[PDB]
Amino acid sequence: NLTGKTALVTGSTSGIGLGIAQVLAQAGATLILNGFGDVDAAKDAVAQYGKTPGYHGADLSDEAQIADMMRYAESEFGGVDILINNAGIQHVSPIETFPVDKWNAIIAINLSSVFHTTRLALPGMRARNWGRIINIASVHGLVASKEKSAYVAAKHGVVGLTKTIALETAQTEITCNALCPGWVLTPLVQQQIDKRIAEGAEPEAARDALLAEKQPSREFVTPEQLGNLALFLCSDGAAQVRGVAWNMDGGWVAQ
Amino acid sequence: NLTGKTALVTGSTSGIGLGIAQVLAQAGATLILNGFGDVDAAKDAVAQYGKTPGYHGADLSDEAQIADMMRYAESEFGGVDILINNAGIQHVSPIETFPVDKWNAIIAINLSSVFHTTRLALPGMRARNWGRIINIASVHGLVASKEKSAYVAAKHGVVGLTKTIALETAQTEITCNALCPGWVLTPLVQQQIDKRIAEGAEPEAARDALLAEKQPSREFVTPEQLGNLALFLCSDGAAQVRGVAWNMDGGWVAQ
Amino acid sequence: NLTGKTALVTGSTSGIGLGIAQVLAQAGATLILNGFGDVDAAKDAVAQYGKTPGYHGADLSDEAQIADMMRYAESEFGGVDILINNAGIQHVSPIETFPVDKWNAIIAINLSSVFHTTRLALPGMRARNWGRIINIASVHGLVASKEKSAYVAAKHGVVGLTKTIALETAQTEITCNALCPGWVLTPLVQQQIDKRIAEGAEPEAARDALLAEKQPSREFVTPEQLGNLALFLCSDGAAQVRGVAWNMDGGWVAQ
Amino acid sequence: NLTGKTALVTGSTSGIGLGIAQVLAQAGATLILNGFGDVDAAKDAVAQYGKTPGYHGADLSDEAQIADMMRYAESEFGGVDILINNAGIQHVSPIETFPVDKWNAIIAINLSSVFHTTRLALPGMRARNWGRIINIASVHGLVASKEKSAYVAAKHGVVGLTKTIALETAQTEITCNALCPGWVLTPLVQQQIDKRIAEGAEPEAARDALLAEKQPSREFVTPEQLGNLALFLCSDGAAQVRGVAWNMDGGWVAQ
Ligand SMILES: NC(=O)c1ccc[n+]([C@@H]2O[C@H](COP(=O)([O-])OP(=O)(O)OC[C@H]3O[C@@H](n4cnc5c(N)ncnc54)[C@H](O)[C@@H]3O)[C@@H](O)[C@H]2O)c1
Ligand SMILES: NC(=O)c1ccc[n+]([C@@H]2O[C@H](COP(=O)([O-])OP(=O)(O)OC[C@H]3O[C@@H](n4cnc5c(N)ncnc54)[C@H](O)[C@@H]3O)[C@@H](O)[C@H]2O)c1
């Protein structure tokens, strides 16, 4: 189904990216993992679904390490066919006391890394005339929240970047699209929940408290749901899906 | 997959609607077709892939006929689990010389029919706590083209309507979403192309004729691709996709 | 400034329409008022700012009365130069128990009247090659709220209708735009404010009780603020403002 | 009107920024210009309408220079009341061969400079509980065009950033909004028009040529028209306009 396709999922040693990675693995694709933390756990969790994945530990905030990483992809796997730009970081702060370092890193990782990977994978994709570039944005690429200025900017930046590359590839068999999830039950978010429960909150009170304001369904998006959406974007049934910001968000943007 | 679930697709005797019906049918779904023309050919086109579909010939511009269709879906098939609002007529004209009956018929069929089917299907869906409401809007639900004032107003309307319904059902296992296609290769459009080709035009040349202005990829969207996106919305993968307006449009809205 | 221009504002006997009228009259415009209730109070509240206004009691839910009103505008003032479609009505209800009557009325008044007025004033505007069509929609022409299906549909529809008419007049000195306010302090909203104060709530506690969820500024838009925006749209600095849905909403849609 | 208020306009030694500076000056504002080129001409061009403006030559891609500009504003004029982020640069290129240094420059100037200038002005504004922040994005903050990946990403970014700042200030008398113009008749545009006219093109034909694809009115936006929209945003009539992205574009985004 995706057999003979190489998928690069950026920041896939945890959360959403690992979810998406496992799903593509299940579908038959060769995966290259990226990101820090528990790395052989990440490799193995994907390995259980087919081919053992490759790995490059590029720090995405560094243009040099990305170039290195892409050559590795090309030298060892013959070039990326499916590029999932997923990695990203957060910093919540009022703007007047938002750290400049944090601004530069959030831009570098959440916006500029998508430019750099897409830059380096596209030539190979054009030669083979086939490709999938999927950028994991956020609801915050479509709307904003207070105290997330660098993140909302970068993610908005991602959405615009995506429509551009889509138009640049419009007349080829290469598509470029963005997913915009709302709250996803990742390691980070389950932490916030379990330690509301620890305060005395009932589970389905800890959850919807954290989700009431922004997400009408009062339910989380799962990494698996996103992985299934990315897989549909990789399918032939998505041949004319181009330049889109598809939200999976329990009703967030509809509101 | 969709075995034991009843899907009603309005305007499914031809084109986009018929394509979506076949795709749900092969996925196990029990269908009810709607529309005019060669019904037995529409029936046979579906029964080829799955169960012999039901049929009801309601004029969608008549509120009472729609109610009979829902009374039919309830009696004979146990109610609607998957409601696909699809049918949608057209009249190109400057607003100044735009016939009032034409405005009224377009609003009634392309907008008011969506209100009627969804309000009569939703109680059954709520009792079972499961349902999918999928409205086929268009790119013209998100942007405008000149001389399509009634059509754009209706489709915009359908998008708004979809968002509202999703919010009223956010905390259930019932979702409401809109799909917004660009140019779709219907038989209606194959005939535009053939007639051009019959006058000396190269095939690709006739294709670029129709698509160069509004659709960057210059490739049509197919009913099948739309069926596959509709089927994904029906999956468990789409539990938290709510009140969206997803463009499948060769890059149309991206400009 | 606007002296020598005729402005027709629908539903201008109360609230938002009356405010816009008073501002336009102040700017020199001849006004034609429309709407029900305390008519003389409205006529005089306008005439205090200069020229004493005209009036027509067309029920905008009926197509033929709008034809009467418009032909009265032409046969008594020599046409409309500035058409403010403001009239609107509301019904809050879950969809499955939404009255069909209210649905039809809300569509007729909030959406279809804009079609009927615009199609009748436009020929005259085209002859004089100058015109302002300004449609008061809502934030609900852009996002949705539960239990307001007919209203959100109509207003979304209005936004789409505006975009098309703007494209149709693109190359003339006629512009067509929409305004999308959030909560505005009109007599119905103030009556809800006093409702809570009498309940025991302190004033600035009753307002944000009404505005917290949807309007981040926790401050009302005023009919005067809207009238000043509409006036700017009538100016020549707004020559190239076309197809627009400008929100004035205290941060509603940014969220 | 604006008497007593200090306005800083980045990139105001020419074009859009100079047009906006002139409109604010004649409204009574004290201006601080910024940018390169013929500075004394720019000062003179503003002083003819109102007070002799200040100037600061900060490189907007350099964060420390920006902070010196703001320290200059605090020391010489008492702080910024009206901050207008206007300065923006362009590089047209397919992403594959898009120079890195150009990507970094465009992001820094068109996006990060908005963050730095706004984070430094906001304390002053908050203390006085009054302020306007107006960011000149472009239609490319809302849609994409081919081969402007850095510019579209940056401008989209500005739009997101604008929304989130609006929200951090929603309950103050400080507003933050984005203006998104289409093609503006700047000197560069007028001089590429003269180029075509010098080669035999009729005037309208040359303008038609430049505007045909993307701007339906086929008429340019002017710096003065933009200045007057900015000035309206600075009025009390705009108190509840927050985190908007208002297009003034001859119908570009309406398509
Ligand atoms: N968690 C949510 O609710 C949510 C919602 C919407 C969008 N998103 C987006 O999905 C993406 C993944 O977020 P997540 O929730 O799965 O978090 P996560 O921490 O679980 O995983 C993020 C990945 O990014 C990696 N990473 C961080 N910095 C890196 C760097 N400099 N170089 C290389 N890798 C780096 C991490 O190693 C990790 O593998 C993000 O872009 C996020 O904005 C998340
Ligand atoms: N009040 C708000 O907070 C708010 C917010 C956003 C948008 N709007 C919209 O502004 C417009 C007016 O709102 P409002 O608050 O001033 O209401 P309002 O009740 O104070 O008065 C509006 C006008 O509508 C007239 N009207 C109603 N039905 C009519 C009919 N069949 N024929 C002729 N006139 C009719 C009324 O006579 C009145 O003059 C509407 O379109 C509304 O949706 C209001």
Author numbering:
A (entry chain D), B (entry chain C), C (entry chain B), D (entry chain A): 2 to 256
Provide text from the study:
E. coli cells containing CL-GESSNitR-L117F were transformed with the pET28a(+) plasmid encoding an individual ORF to detect the fluorescence signal corresponding to the conversion of 6-ACA to ε-caprolactam. We found that an ORF encoding 3-hydroxybutyrate dehydrogenase from Citrobacter freundii (CF3HBD) was positive for this activity (number 2 in Fig. 4b). Basically, the screened CF3HBDs belong to the NAD(P)H-dependent short-chain dehydrogenase family, and they have cyclization activity as unexpected promiscuous activity. d-3-Hydroxybutyrate dehydrogenase catalyzed the reversible and stereospecific oxidation of d-3-hydroxybutyric acid to acetoacetate using NAD+ as a coenzyme. The resulting isolate, CF3HBD is a unique biocatalyst with lactam-synthesizing activity as promiscuous activity that does not require a cofactor or energy source in an in vitro system. In addition, we found that CF3HBD could catalyze the degradation of the cyclic amide group in ε-caprolactam, generating 6-ACA as a reaction product.
To further characterize the cyclization activity, we determined the crystal structure of CF3HBD in complex with NAD+ at a resolution of 2.29 Å. We found that the asymmetric unit had a tetramer structure with two NAD+-free subunits. Nearly all of the residues were well defined in the electron-density map, except the unidentified electron density located in the pocket near the nicotinamide group of NAD+, which corresponded to the active site of CF3HBD. Based on its position, this density could represent a molecule of ε-caprolactam transiently captured by the enzyme during crystal packing. Molecular docking of CF3HBD with 6-ACA and ε-caprolactam in the unidentified electron density was achieved using the holo form of CF3HBD. The docking results suggested that 10 residues (Q91, S139, V140, H141, K149, Y152, Q193, W184, V190, and Q193) located within 4.0 Å of the center of the docked substrate are active-site residues. Alanine substitution of the catalytic residues, such as Q91, S139, and H141 completely abolished catalytic activity towards both 3-hydroxybutyric acid and 6-ACA, which suggested that dehydrogenation activity and cyclization activity share catalytic site. Alanine substitution at V140, Y152, and W184 resulted in lack of activity towards 3-hydroxybutyric acid, whereas these mutants showed cyclization activities for 6-ACA of more than 80%. Interestingly, the Y152A mutant showed the highest cyclization activity, with a three-fold increase, for 6-ACA. The Y152A mutant had about 3.4-fold higher catalytic efficiency than that of wild-type enzyme. This result suggested that an alanine residue may be preferred rather than the bulky aromatic amino acid to allow 6-ACA in the active site, but not 3-hydroxybutyric acid.
